[PDB]
């Protein structure tokens, strides 16, 4: 009866394993997407025009 325990264990562990590589490469694309956001937002953290105001009188 320990044979069918290892039957279900290997099928579930292998299904979770191929689950893992597709999921890691899915979060890898989200890593690349936000790294584009980081290198973008810091670049024009110096080119924003500062506003200046003067009194009416």
């Amino acid at each position: 009866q320990e044979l069918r325990v290892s039957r279900m264990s290997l099928m579930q562990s292998q299904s979770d394993l191929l689950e893992a590589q597709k999921m890691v490469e899915e979060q890898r694309l989200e890593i690349q997407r936000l790294y584009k956001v980081i290198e973008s937002l810091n670049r024009e953290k110096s080119l924003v025009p500062p506003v200046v105001l003067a009194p009416a009188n």
Binding site: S46, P49, P50, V52
Partner: protein, 99 residues
């Protein structure tokens, strides 16, 4: 001495009125440094301001005005305590009439 009812009624009315007019203490300001000189000159430089300009901090003025307003708010707290004691005495008298 006719209807302590109506008298205490007007008393508690004045109470509600003043009691509820909330008053918020002066607000806190950026921890002194802000906007940090080092950064101010950068702002005064990315502005392309024609006339050459300097950064005149005013932190001190804001802080002492806050001192004055907090002094005023403490005076307000004192006035409040006094009015509370007055209403207490008024209640004492109206209660004798009610007994």
């Amino acid at each position: 001495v006719a209807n302590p009812s109506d008298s205490l009624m007007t008393l508690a009315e004045k109470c509600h009125q003043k009691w509820s007019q909330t008053k918020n203490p002066p607000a806190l300001s950026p921890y002194p440094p802000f906007p940090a000189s080092e950064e101010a000159e950068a702002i005064l430089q990315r502005a392309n301001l024609d006339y050459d300009a300097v950064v005149m901090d005013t932190t001190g003025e804001h802080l002492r005005e806050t001192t004055k307003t907090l002094v005023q708010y403490s005076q307000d707290i004192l006035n409040r305590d006094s009015t509370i004691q007055s209403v207490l005495k008024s209640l004492k008298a109206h209660g004798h009439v009610g007994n």
